[PDB]
Amino acid sequence: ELEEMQRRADQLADESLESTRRMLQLVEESKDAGIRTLVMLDEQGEQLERIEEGMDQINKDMKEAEKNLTDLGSGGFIRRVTNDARENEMDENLEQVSGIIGNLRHMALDMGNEIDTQNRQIDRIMEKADSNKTRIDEANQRATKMLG
Amino acid sequence: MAGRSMQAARCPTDELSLSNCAVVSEKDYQSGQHVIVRTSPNHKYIFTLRTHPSVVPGSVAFSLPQRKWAGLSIGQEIEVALYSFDKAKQCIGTMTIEIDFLQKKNIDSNPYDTDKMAAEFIQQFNNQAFSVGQQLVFSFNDKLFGLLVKDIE
Amino acid sequence: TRHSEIIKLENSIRELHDMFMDMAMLVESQGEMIDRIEYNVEHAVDYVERAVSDTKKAVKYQS
Amino acid sequence: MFMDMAMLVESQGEMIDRIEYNVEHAVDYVERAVSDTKKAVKYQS
Amino acid sequence: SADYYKGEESNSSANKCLLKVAGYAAQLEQYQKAIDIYEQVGTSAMDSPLLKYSAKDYFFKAALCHFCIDMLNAKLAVQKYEELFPAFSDSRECKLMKKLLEAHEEQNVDSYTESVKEYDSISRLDQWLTTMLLRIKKT
Amino acid sequence: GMDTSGKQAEAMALLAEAERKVKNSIEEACEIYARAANMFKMAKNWSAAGNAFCQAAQLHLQLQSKHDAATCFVDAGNAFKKADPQEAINCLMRAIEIYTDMGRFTIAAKHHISIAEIYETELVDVEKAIAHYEQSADYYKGEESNSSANKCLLKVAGYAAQLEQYQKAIDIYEQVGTSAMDSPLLKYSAKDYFFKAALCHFCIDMLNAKLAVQKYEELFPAFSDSRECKLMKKLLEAHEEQNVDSYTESVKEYDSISRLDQWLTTMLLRIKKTIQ
Amino acid sequence: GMDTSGKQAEAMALLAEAERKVKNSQSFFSGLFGGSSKIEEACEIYARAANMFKMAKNWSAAGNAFCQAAQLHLQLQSKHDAATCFVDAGNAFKKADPQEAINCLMRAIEIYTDMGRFTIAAKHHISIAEIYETELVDVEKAIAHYEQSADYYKGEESNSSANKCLLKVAGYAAQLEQYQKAIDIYEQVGTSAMDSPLLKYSAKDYFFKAALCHFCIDMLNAKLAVQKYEELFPAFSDSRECKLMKKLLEAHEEQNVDSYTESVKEYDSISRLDQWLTTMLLRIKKT
């Protein structure tokens, strides 16, 4: 009876250790995942800037061509209820995790510093693109005005 | 002789399994013959042939204990070649077989006359090939036994 | 002190969840806009290519 | 959900690279058309 | 705008507009339309591969509206929501719903105060959520 | 309301004018038809606008149009998607054919996916959806689209395991795992694919399943590290010893620790049905 | 399948019609001087035939048709369209065999760099490097192609792509037993990354790579490199890489091979190892 309860308590402690190890491993993997996500987001932002510059150049060239054409004409983590050395390491692990998660939070903010802004920029160029299309369409119509 | 491709087959009847003979088709194989079966680069096992109409044409089938010992599964491919026994060095002095009960429900502690068991084993498996480490099933007086060959001297 | 660290971790997790949701919705909107502009630019480039090819053919035939 | 984000961002990145290639093709086509037009009008004059 | 987006098949903008209008209606005491919109958004998120895990929160909003209507039908409504989405059990929204029901069953001051304090300790409740909570608690 | 009636009258007048112009007689008729379709769409009456869209598409394609005709056909199909699924499917298939003849496989694959999903949700059809998914997968393979190709492969493997033979799904899972082994980012999902294959291998035989899971573990070391390996070991031991209590305890523990989407539970029940 | 057979038959008929049209184009030009419309029509028909072959999944036939269209349009002086057709032919060949793709991409790069299309030339150099890496094992050629692509990218001021090529080149070089170049590239990338907060985190990996590369030389210079990295980036101590290299140095100070193996296993458990990491660790254990 009591021996079975003690065995169950020991198994629960082992499960807690396994959970702590899984937590540590998962956070460690998430750190690399976040680093890769950050670098990929930076690459995507640079690509978006390269697209915006190209579209601005397209608009400038189209306007110049149209003009030319028109003008042509911490305190504790695990209670020492069961003693054992394991608890010690457990504490450290959670402490480590704490620090890590703090760091992780910072990384999140970093991504934001770019993400939202990029979206806004995209919207602007999108509008311009539509206008540009209309303009060339109008030019085509104007090109057909003289033909009749 | 040269070897041919084959499809894995399962023994259809318990009586065929009780004889510890590989069930083969009459078209290419005949009862009483011995074959060597290659299942991997260095896995070879010798089995006796028993004919049964239900066998798939050109196929060799083994009982569940034989498949488990050889790790045979439906859909896998193994090689089978006819073999001829040479008594120059294959004479058997005595066989040592480890015997176990297949089902726990039928286990009894009563003594058994091992001479009768040996005689029945020889009669049921006469003119058959046995290799060390072979796992098989044996029926004796409505009693099932899992037999493992310790050694042949 | 355990309760303080627990609540701090929970608050951090909730803030991360909220930021995740917001930026994920924003990224989905960004993807929708990028798809729309891709389609628009493809249509525009195809149309201008066809128009310029027709103009070149017409001028070459006339001259 | 982080794994889902990772796959979604990978898809967005590949699509953005394809869009960049399309943009390069379109700008080259437009530049060639403008060059041909300017040369033709200069020769006509 | 929501109708135009639906005609154009824009899920994100349509969902945003529906959520905004449902919230405004709830602030205006039009519980039926707000609860219908919240339920539709929640089921759509559940069906969609993404935003399903957050759909629980949306469900709570719908529940809140029903919680203002009556108490005897509240048990049936929560049972239907649970059986519809069995995974909702582990959600803290179900905990809030059951705690609020229990607090309203017995006329005492400590239950609702401690419930609101505990739920605030995690995240700051929205102004509309707090207004509806105060309205239901006062009666 | 009055707005709907006015827009309907305007659309009818524009259609009559376009019919008169085409009878007398070139792009003016198509422009009038498109304007009528847009005006009808303004009314919010999705019905009867698709007819104008189809008339415009046919008239514009009759004069050798390739890009604009395809875009108009796609718009007509999208308009019918809410109004009439069959007409939407027909318009989408015509646009697919036109674009593929033009060489634009992306639009064709997207329209095939849309047709498959509309068949799965609105109508009742899976085989045609599977064929459309396979065609889209081939089209995106022509474009070496890794993400779309992987998604289509996963969907096809899942559907085949649910209904069809398992060899294709098993091979797809093995190939995906091998490809992801070198890739670090995707390695985490790789194990899952192997796990899926194991379940499929159980539909044939228990010893075959044991061999398949052993092969998957050997091929990918990480598959052994995950607790899923222990879960499979326990499941196989319980099946070997023929003890329903252990199976029930294992499935209950898996459900409690991790939520289920009715797929793993279905496969576990199928496996247990033959335990006898 | 019947549909595939019909598509193949239609593609063969279209190819025969294109052959007849290109044959008769010369006769028409000689007898009437009708212009170059025949060549353009033949190129369009070849493109359609390639599309049909892709329908039937024939890489070789589509590549041959694309090559024929490319040469036909090159005879038309349309250098840009000829280069585009050659690039399409190379892409088609990449499906089956990039043997022709090498010369196709070389010609495309030459044409593009003649006019100033540097971005596409750099992308084609990257494609050539990938083809060489996947087909052959000659790393040096891939490195040279990557440097050429990076130079072309910097020529157009289009960054965010040359940096990745340089990083991949450094990763390859670290495995080729070359110290000076790999260390210089790693330190340059790290010092560039520290300035940018987003990439500052990635600098630790490059510092660890440089430390491992310099560790094979000797323990004394390895300690100096570790101290230099610590002084430059003290926060590098927080990363597990610095702890790992310090543990390896301490174990080698006493030749405690069991401790080294335990540390390596612990690091692998913390994060799955890579082929380069395992190779470097095995090489370091040699001394």
Curated annotation (Swiss-Prot), chain A:
Region (Interaction with CENPF): 1-66
Post-translational modification: Palmitoylated. (Microbial infection) Targeted and hydrolyzed by C.botulinum neurotoxin type A (BoNT/A, botA) which hydrolyzes the 197-Gln-|-Arg-198 bond and inhibits neurotransmitter release.
Record-annotated t-SNARE coiled-coil homology domain positions: 10-72, 84-146
Gene Ontology biological process terms, A to Z: associative learning; axonogenesis; calcium ion-regulated exocytosis of neurotransmitter; endosomal transport; exocytosis; locomotory behavior; long-term memory; long-term synaptic potentiation
Keywords: Cell membrane, Coiled coil, Cytoplasm, Lipoprotein, Membrane, Palmitate, Phosphoprotein, Repeat, Synapse, Synaptosome
GO cellular component entries: actin cytoskeleton; axon; axonal growth cone; BLOC-1 complex; cell cortex; cytoplasm; cytoskeleton; endosome
Superkingdom of origin organism: Eukaryota
Site ((Microbial infection) Cleavage): R124, I125, Q141, R142
Pfam families on file: SNAP-25 (PF00835)
Region (Disordered): 1-14
Entry-linked PROSITE patterns: T_SNARE (PS50192)
SMART domains: t_SNARE
Any GO MF annotation of the entry: protein domain specific binding
Modified residues (Phosphothreonine): T82
Subcellular location field: Cytoplasm, Perinuclear region; Cell membrane; Synapse, Synaptosome; Photoreceptor inner segment
Chain positions with Phosphoserine modification: S98, S131
Claim: Hydrolase is one of the keywords in the record: no
Membrane topology term: Lipid-anchor
CDD domains named among the record's database cross-references: SNARE_SNAP25C, SNARE_SNAP25N
PANTHER family referenced in this protein's UniProt entry, alphabetically: SYNAPTOSOMAL ASSOCIATED PROTEIN (PTHR19305), SYNAPTOSOMAL-ASSOCIATED PROTEIN 25 (PTHR19305:SF5)
Protein family (similarity comment): Belongs to the SNAP-25 family.
Protein name: Synaptosomal-associated protein 25
Gene name tied to this protein: Snap25
UniProtKB/Swiss-Prot annotation, chain B:
Subcellular location: Cytoplasm
S-S bridge residues: none
Modified residues (N6-acetyllysine): K105
Self-association state and partner proteins as the record states: Homohexamer. Interacts with GABARAP and GABARAPL2. Interacts with GRIA2. Interacts with PLK2, leading to disrupt the interaction with GRIA2. Interacts with MUSK; may regulate MUSK endocytosis and activity. Interacts with CDK16.
Entry's family note: Belongs to the AAA ATPase family.
Function summary: Required for vesicle-mediated transport. Catalyzes the fusion of transport vesicles within the Golgi cisternae. Is also required for transport from the endoplasmic reticulum to the Golgi stack. Seems to function as a fusion protein required for the delivery of cargo proteins to all compartments of the Golgi stack independent of vesicle origin. Interaction with AMPAR subunit GRIA2 leads to influence GRIA2 membrane cycling.
Name of the featured protein: Vesicle-fusing ATPase
Organism from which the protein derives: Cricetulus griseus
Parent-record interval covered: 1 to 153 of 744
UniProtKB/Swiss-Prot annotation, chain D:
Cross-link Glycyl lysine isopeptide (Lys-Gly) (interchain with G-Cter in SUMO) placement: K38, K39, K42
Domain t-SNARE coiled-coil homology: 1-40
Signal peptide interval: none
Cellular compartment(s): Cytoplasmic vesicle, Secretory vesicle, Synaptic vesicle membrane; Cell membrane; Synapse, Synaptosome
Tissue: Expressed predominantly in cerebral cortex, hippocampus, cerebellum, adrenal medulla and retina with weak expression detected in non-neuronal tissues.
Protein family (similarity comment): Belongs to the syntaxin family.
Protein name, as recorded: Syntaxin-1A
Range of the intact protein held here: 215 to 259 of 288
UniProtKB/Swiss-Prot annotation, chain G:
Domain of life: Eukaryota
Recorded GO CC terms: glutamatergic synapse; neuromuscular junction; postsynapse; presynapse; presynaptic active zone membrane; synaptobrevin 2-SNAP-25-syntaxin-1a complex; terminal bouton
Keywords: Acetylation, Cell membrane, ER-Golgi transport, Membrane, Phosphoprotein, Protein transport, Transport
An individual GO BP term: protein-containing complex disassembly
Subcellular location per the Swiss-Prot or TrEMBL entry: Cell membrane
Membrane association type: Peripheral membrane protein
Residues with Phosphoserine modification: S27, S30, S196
Major place of residence: membrane
Modified residue annotations for N-acetylmethionine: M2
GO terms assigned for molecular function: protein-containing complex binding; SNARE binding; soluble NSF attachment protein activity; syntaxin binding
Family membership: Belongs to the SNAP family.
Function, as annotated: Required for vesicular transport between the endoplasmic reticulum and the Golgi apparatus. Together with GNA12 promotes CDH5 localization to plasma membrane.
Subunit structure: Interacts with PRKCABP, and disrupts the interaction between GRIA2 and PRKCABP, leading to the internalization of GRIA2. Found in a complex with VAMP8. Component of a SNARE-like complex that contains at least ZW10, USE1L, RINT1, STX18 and NAPA/SNAP-alpha. Interacts with VTI1A. Interacts with STX12. Interacts with GNA12 (via N-terminus); the interaction promotes CDH5 localization to plasma membrane.
Name this protein carries in UniProt: Alpha-soluble NSF attachment protein
Annotated source species: Rattus norvegicus
Gene behind this protein: Napa
